[PDB]
Every structure is written in structure tokens, then in C-alpha cells.
Amino acid sequence: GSHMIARIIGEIGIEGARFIEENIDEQFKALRYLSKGIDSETFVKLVIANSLVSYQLTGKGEQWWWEFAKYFYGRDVKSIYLAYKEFLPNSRFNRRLIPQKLSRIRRVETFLSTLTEERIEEYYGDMSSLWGSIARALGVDKESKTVVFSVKMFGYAARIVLSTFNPYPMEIPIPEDSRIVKLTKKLTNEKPRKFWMKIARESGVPPLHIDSILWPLLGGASIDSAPPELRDKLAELIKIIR
DNA sequence: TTTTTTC
């Protein structure tokens, strides 16, 4: 792992990650916008469906999640599969692997249909069971990138809908992808998957909350709105990993 | 433009 990184991430803490999530994270902003233009249950269903097709994008993540939010705001959505069948081929930022992606939506449509208000609250109180349930519906490994971040974005949606905050489970790990490998190789020769899981365990900050911290800081987003005590912590983290 | 997944 990294004692240097884990100590500063521990100082930032779940509440520092939460500040970034609710103030800087553009995915959270797009979700908060969408939640104002569609009913709560459809909102959460769409966010999970979107997460499951958000890979190998023809654009950057922030652009795509705003495109998704702007597309469904005020839209009358019945079948989520049918909605995506029309949305994806006309989108700007998600035009690759549409046949594969539509088939994943079709296969998870029955699980999404169980997401009443009460079911969404139950899963938000036990995101590990939601993690396993989504993977089982798809027939994939729950540690796969899309399933892990379907849980993260569900957590964004659920905290908006329910006006409560439950931290992500510690046992949901960041999987390896292109940008986590590119960054981690500069920091260490350790295996990226093991590196970041040990950092989460040592710091006390679940991996999905660490993810919220890393990318805005690396991408150069302003941290000036953070309170000075948290700002100085994020500043030191930047000097360590950027 | 190059920004995970398959059955």
C-alpha cells in the first residue's frame, strides 16, 4: 500500500470525499439535475442502467453523464431497454459497443423493475447485496468495473432521493482500468488493485469514496470552495499524486 | 476519437 497516501486520505476522510462528491463531482451534478425532471424510481433505474453501459465511451465521463441527464430530463420513460435502444445510436458520447450494451440493459430490465421506493431504501442500507444482485442479473463478476460503479452511482442517486447518507462498503474495491493503471504505475510498482485496496483499509476510507477524491484532484478542478482545513489536506494530496 | 466488455 502507501502510508503516505493512506494517512492523507484518512485525514480527508469519508466527509472530505463526501464534500467533493456533493460539490465538485460533475456526475453528481448531472444526477441532481436529472432527479428534478423525472420520478424518483425511474431516476434510480436509469442511473443503474446508464452505469452498466458507461464504458468505452466516445467521450469523457463528465460529458456523457450530462448528456444522459439532459436527455432523460422531462422524458416519458416506459421500457428502459426501448429508451436506450433509441438513445444510444443518436448520442454523442456513447456510440461504441451499442449491441453489447443494449443486451446488458435487456438482461437487467427485470431486476430494475423491482426498484420501488422501499426496495431502493433497502439496497441503500445494504449496498453489498445490491452489488451482488446486479452482477447476478447480468451473469458477470461483481468486481467488474461497470458493476462496481453502478453501485457508486446508485449511491449518488439514492442519497439525492432519500436525503440520507450511507458510506460505500469498504469491501467494494476499485477494479483495474486504463486510467487507474496509468496513474498507479507512476506512484508504485505494486499491483494497482492490491495497492488501492490496502490504502482504503489503512485509511478507513472505502475505495469508492477514494475514487471520488482522486479524479477531480488529478484533473485540476478547483478545491477553493473546500473549508481551509480540508483544502490544505487536498492540496497536500495533490502534491503527492499529481 | 481512441476518452471494458464478451456468453
CSV table of C-alpha atoms in Angstrom, one decimal, chain A:
chain,number,residue,atom,x,y,z
A,1,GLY,CA,0.0,0.0,0.0
A,2,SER,CA,1.1,3.6,0.8
A,3,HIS,CA,1.4,5.0,4.3
A,4,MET,CA,1.9,8.5,2.7
A,5,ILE,CA,-1.3,8.3,0.7
A,6,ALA,CA,-3.3,6.4,3.3
A,7,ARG,CA,-2.5,8.9,6.1
A,8,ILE,CA,-3.6,12.0,4.0
A,9,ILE,CA,-6.7,10.1,2.7
A,10,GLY,CA,-7.5,9.3,6.3
A,11,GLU,CA,-7.3,13.0,7.2
A,12,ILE,CA,-9.6,13.9,4.3
A,13,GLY,CA,-11.9,11.1,5.4
A,14,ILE,CA,-15.3,10.0,4.3
A,15,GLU,CA,-16.5,13.5,5.0
A,16,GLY,CA,-13.9,15.1,2.7
A,17,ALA,CA,-14.7,12.6,-0.1
A,18,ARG,CA,-18.4,13.5,0.5
A,19,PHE,CA,-17.6,17.2,0.1
A,20,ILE,CA,-16.0,16.6,-3.3
A,21,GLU,CA,-18.9,14.3,-4.3
A,22,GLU,CA,-21.6,16.8,-3.4
A,23,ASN,CA,-19.8,20.0,-4.5
A,24,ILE,CA,-17.3,19.2,-7.3
A,25,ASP,CA,-18.2,15.8,-8.9
A,26,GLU,CA,-19.8,16.6,-12.2
A,27,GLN,CA,-21.6,13.2,-12.2
A,28,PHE,CA,-23.3,14.1,-9.0
A,29,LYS,CA,-24.3,17.5,-10.5
A,30,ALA,CA,-25.8,15.8,-13.6
A,31,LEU,CA,-27.7,13.3,-11.4
A,32,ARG,CA,-29.1,16.1,-9.2
A,33,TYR,CA,-30.3,17.9,-12.3
A,34,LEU,CA,-32.0,14.8,-13.7
A,35,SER,CA,-33.7,14.0,-10.3
A,36,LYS,CA,-35.6,17.2,-10.7
A,37,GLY,CA,-37.1,16.1,-14.1
A,38,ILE,CA,-38.3,12.6,-13.6
A,39,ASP,CA,-39.8,10.5,-10.9
A,40,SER,CA,-37.6,9.0,-8.1
A,41,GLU,CA,-38.0,5.4,-9.1
A,42,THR,CA,-37.3,5.8,-12.8
A,43,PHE,CA,-34.4,8.1,-11.9
A,44,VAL,CA,-32.7,5.4,-9.9
A,45,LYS,CA,-33.5,2.7,-12.5
A,46,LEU,CA,-32.0,4.9,-15.3
A,47,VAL,CA,-28.8,5.7,-13.3
A,48,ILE,CA,-28.1,2.0,-12.8
A,49,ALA,CA,-28.9,1.2,-16.5
A,50,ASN,CA,-26.6,4.1,-17.5
A,51,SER,CA,-23.7,2.9,-15.3
A,52,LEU,CA,-24.0,-0.5,-16.9
A,53,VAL,CA,-23.5,0.9,-20.4
A,54,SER,CA,-20.9,3.6,-19.4
A,55,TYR,CA,-17.7,2.1,-20.7
A,56,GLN,CA,-15.5,2.5,-23.8
A,57,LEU,CA,-17.3,5.9,-24.2
A,58,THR,CA,-16.9,8.1,-27.3
A,59,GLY,CA,-16.2,11.0,-24.9
A,60,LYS,CA,-15.2,11.8,-21.4
A,61,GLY,CA,-17.3,10.6,-18.4
A,62,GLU,CA,-18.5,14.0,-17.3
A,63,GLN,CA,-19.7,14.9,-20.9
A,64,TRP,CA,-21.6,11.6,-21.1
A,65,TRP,CA,-23.3,11.8,-17.8
A,66,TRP,CA,-24.5,15.3,-18.6
A,67,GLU,CA,-25.7,14.1,-22.0
A,68,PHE,CA,-27.6,11.3,-20.2
A,69,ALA,CA,-29.1,13.7,-17.6
A,70,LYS,CA,-30.1,16.2,-20.3
A,71,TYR,CA,-31.6,13.5,-22.5
A,72,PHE,CA,-33.9,12.0,-19.9
A,73,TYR,CA,-34.9,15.2,-18.0
A,74,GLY,CA,-38.6,15.6,-18.6
A,75,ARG,CA,-38.8,12.4,-20.8
A,76,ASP,CA,-41.7,9.9,-20.5
A,77,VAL,CA,-39.8,6.6,-20.0
A,78,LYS,CA,-41.6,3.3,-20.1
A,79,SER,CA,-39.3,0.5,-21.1
A,80,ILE,CA,-35.7,1.3,-20.2
A,81,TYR,CA,-34.4,-1.0,-22.9
A,82,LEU,CA,-36.6,0.7,-25.5
A,83,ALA,CA,-35.4,4.1,-24.2
A,84,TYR,CA,-31.7,3.1,-24.6
A,85,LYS,CA,-32.3,1.4,-28.0
A,86,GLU,CA,-33.3,4.9,-29.2
A,87,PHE,CA,-30.9,7.0,-27.1
A,88,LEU,CA,-27.5,5.3,-27.7
A,89,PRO,CA,-27.2,5.3,-31.5
A,90,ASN,CA,-28.1,9.0,-31.5
A,91,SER,CA,-25.9,10.0,-28.6
A,92,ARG,CA,-22.6,11.9,-29.0
A,93,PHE,CA,-20.6,10.3,-26.2
A,94,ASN,CA,-21.7,6.6,-26.1
A,95,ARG,CA,-21.6,5.3,-29.7
A,96,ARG,CA,-19.4,2.2,-29.3
A,97,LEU,CA,-20.5,-1.4,-28.5
A,98,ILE,CA,-24.2,-0.5,-28.7
A,99,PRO,CA,-25.4,-4.1,-29.4
A,100,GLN,CA,-23.4,-5.4,-26.4
A,101,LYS,CA,-24.7,-2.6,-24.2
A,102,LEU,CA,-28.4,-2.9,-25.3
A,103,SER,CA,-28.2,-6.6,-24.5
A,104,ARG,CA,-27.0,-5.9,-21.0
A,105,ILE,CA,-29.9,-3.5,-20.4
A,106,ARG,CA,-32.3,-6.1,-21.7
A,107,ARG,CA,-31.0,-8.7,-19.3
A,108,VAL,CA,-31.1,-6.5,-16.2
A,109,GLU,CA,-34.5,-5.0,-17.0
A,110,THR,CA,-36.4,-7.4,-14.8
A,111,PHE,CA,-34.1,-6.6,-11.8
A,112,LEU,CA,-34.5,-2.8,-12.4
A,113,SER,CA,-38.3,-3.3,-12.3
A,114,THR,CA,-38.2,-4.4,-8.7
A,115,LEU,CA,-36.8,-0.9,-7.6
A,116,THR,CA,-39.7,0.6,-5.8
A,117,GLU,CA,-39.1,3.4,-3.3
A,118,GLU,CA,-38.9,0.8,-0.5
A,119,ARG,CA,-36.6,-1.6,-2.4
A,120,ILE,CA,-34.3,1.4,-3.2
A,121,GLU,CA,-34.1,2.3,0.5
A,122,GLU,CA,-33.3,-1.4,1.4
A,123,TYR,CA,-30.5,-1.5,-1.1
A,124,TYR,CA,-29.1,1.8,0.0
A,125,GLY,CA,-28.9,0.4,3.5
A,126,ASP,CA,-27.1,-2.7,2.1
A,127,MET,CA,-25.2,-1.8,-1.0
A,128,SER,CA,-23.2,-5.0,-0.9
A,129,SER,CA,-26.4,-7.0,-1.5
A,130,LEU,CA,-27.2,-4.7,-4.4
A,131,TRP,CA,-23.7,-5.2,-5.7
A,132,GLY,CA,-24.2,-8.9,-5.8
A,133,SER,CA,-27.7,-8.7,-7.1
A,134,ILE,CA,-26.8,-6.6,-10.2
A,135,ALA,CA,-23.9,-8.9,-11.1
A,136,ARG,CA,-26.1,-12.0,-10.8
A,137,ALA,CA,-28.7,-10.4,-13.0
A,138,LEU,CA,-26.0,-9.8,-15.7
A,139,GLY,CA,-24.2,-13.0,-15.2
A,140,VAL,CA,-20.9,-11.2,-14.7
A,141,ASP,CA,-18.3,-10.8,-11.9
A,142,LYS,CA,-19.4,-8.2,-9.4
A,143,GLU,CA,-15.8,-6.9,-9.3
A,144,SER,CA,-16.1,-5.8,-12.9
A,145,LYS,CA,-15.8,-2.0,-13.5
A,146,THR,CA,-19.3,-1.4,-14.6
A,147,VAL,CA,-21.0,-3.3,-11.8
A,148,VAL,CA,-18.8,-1.6,-9.1
A,149,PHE,CA,-19.6,1.9,-10.4
A,150,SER,CA,-23.3,1.0,-10.9
A,151,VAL,CA,-23.3,0.7,-7.1
A,152,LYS,CA,-21.4,4.0,-6.8
A,153,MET,CA,-23.9,5.9,-9.0
A,154,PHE,CA,-26.8,4.2,-7.3
A,155,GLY,CA,-25.4,5.7,-4.1
A,156,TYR,CA,-25.4,9.1,-5.6
A,157,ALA,CA,-29.0,8.7,-6.8
A,158,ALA,CA,-30.2,7.2,-3.6
A,159,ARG,CA,-28.7,9.9,-1.4
A,160,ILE,CA,-30.5,12.5,-3.5
A,161,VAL,CA,-33.8,10.6,-3.4
A,162,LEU,CA,-33.7,9.6,0.2
A,163,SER,CA,-31.9,12.7,1.7
A,164,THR,CA,-29.7,10.3,3.8
A,165,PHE,CA,-26.0,9.4,3.5
A,166,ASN,CA,-24.7,5.9,3.8
A,167,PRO,CA,-21.0,5.4,3.1
A,168,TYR,CA,-20.0,2.9,0.4
A,169,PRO,CA,-19.0,-0.5,1.8
A,170,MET,CA,-15.2,-1.0,2.4
A,171,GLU,CA,-15.3,-4.4,0.6
A,172,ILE,CA,-16.3,-2.9,-2.8
A,173,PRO,CA,-12.9,-2.4,-4.5
A,174,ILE,CA,-11.8,-0.2,-7.4
A,175,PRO,CA,-11.0,-2.6,-10.3
A,176,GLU,CA,-8.1,-2.0,-12.7
A,177,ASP,CA,-8.8,0.0,-15.8
A,178,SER,CA,-6.7,2.2,-18.2
A,179,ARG,CA,-6.6,5.4,-16.1
A,180,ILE,CA,-6.1,3.7,-12.7
A,181,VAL,CA,-3.1,1.8,-14.2
A,182,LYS,CA,-1.6,4.9,-15.8
A,183,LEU,CA,-1.7,6.7,-12.5
A,184,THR,CA,-0.7,3.9,-10.2
A,185,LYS,CA,2.4,2.9,-12.3
A,186,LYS,CA,3.8,6.4,-11.6
A,187,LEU,CA,3.2,6.0,-7.9
A,188,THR,CA,4.4,2.5,-7.3
A,189,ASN,CA,5.4,-0.8,-8.8
A,190,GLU,CA,2.8,-2.6,-6.7
A,191,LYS,CA,-0.2,-4.2,-8.4
A,192,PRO,CA,-2.8,-1.4,-8.7
A,193,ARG,CA,-5.8,-3.5,-7.4
A,194,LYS,CA,-3.9,-4.5,-4.2
A,195,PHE,CA,-2.3,-1.1,-3.8
A,196,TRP,CA,-5.6,0.8,-3.6
A,197,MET,CA,-7.5,-1.7,-1.5
A,198,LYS,CA,-4.7,-1.6,1.2
A,199,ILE,CA,-4.9,2.2,1.0
A,200,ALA,CA,-8.6,2.1,1.7
A,201,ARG,CA,-8.3,-0.4,4.6
A,202,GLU,CA,-5.4,1.6,6.2
A,203,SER,CA,-7.1,5.0,5.8
A,204,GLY,CA,-10.6,3.9,6.7
A,205,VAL,CA,-12.0,5.5,3.5
A,206,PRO,CA,-13.9,3.0,1.3
A,207,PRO,CA,-12.5,2.6,-2.2
A,208,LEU,CA,-15.5,4.1,-3.9
A,209,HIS,CA,-15.0,7.3,-1.8
A,210,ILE,CA,-11.3,7.3,-2.6
A,211,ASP,CA,-12.3,7.3,-6.3
A,212,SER,CA,-14.4,10.5,-5.7
A,213,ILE,CA,-11.2,12.2,-4.3
A,214,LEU,CA,-8.7,11.1,-7.0
A,215,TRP,CA,-10.0,12.2,-10.3
A,216,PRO,CA,-11.1,15.9,-9.7
A,217,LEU,CA,-7.8,16.5,-7.9
A,218,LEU,CA,-5.8,14.9,-10.8
A,219,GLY,CA,-7.9,16.7,-13.4
A,220,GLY,CA,-7.1,20.2,-11.9
A,221,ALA,CA,-10.6,21.0,-10.5
A,222,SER,CA,-10.6,24.0,-8.1
A,223,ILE,CA,-10.6,23.0,-4.4
A,224,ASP,CA,-11.0,26.6,-3.3
A,225,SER,CA,-14.6,26.1,-2.0
A,226,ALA,CA,-13.4,23.4,0.4
A,227,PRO,CA,-13.1,24.7,4.0
A,228,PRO,CA,-9.5,25.6,4.7
A,229,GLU,CA,-8.8,22.6,6.9
A,230,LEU,CA,-10.0,20.2,4.2
A,231,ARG,CA,-8.5,22.4,1.4
A,232,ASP,CA,-4.9,22.1,2.8
A,233,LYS,CA,-5.4,18.3,3.0
A,234,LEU,CA,-6.5,18.1,-0.6
A,235,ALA,CA,-3.6,20.4,-1.6
A,236,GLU,CA,-1.0,18.0,0.1
A,237,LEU,CA,-2.6,15.0,-1.6
A,238,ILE,CA,-2.3,16.8,-5.0
A,239,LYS,CA,1.5,17.4,-4.4
A,240,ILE,CA,1.8,13.7,-3.6
A,241,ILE,CA,0.0,12.1,-6.5
A,242,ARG,CA,0.0,14.7,-9.3
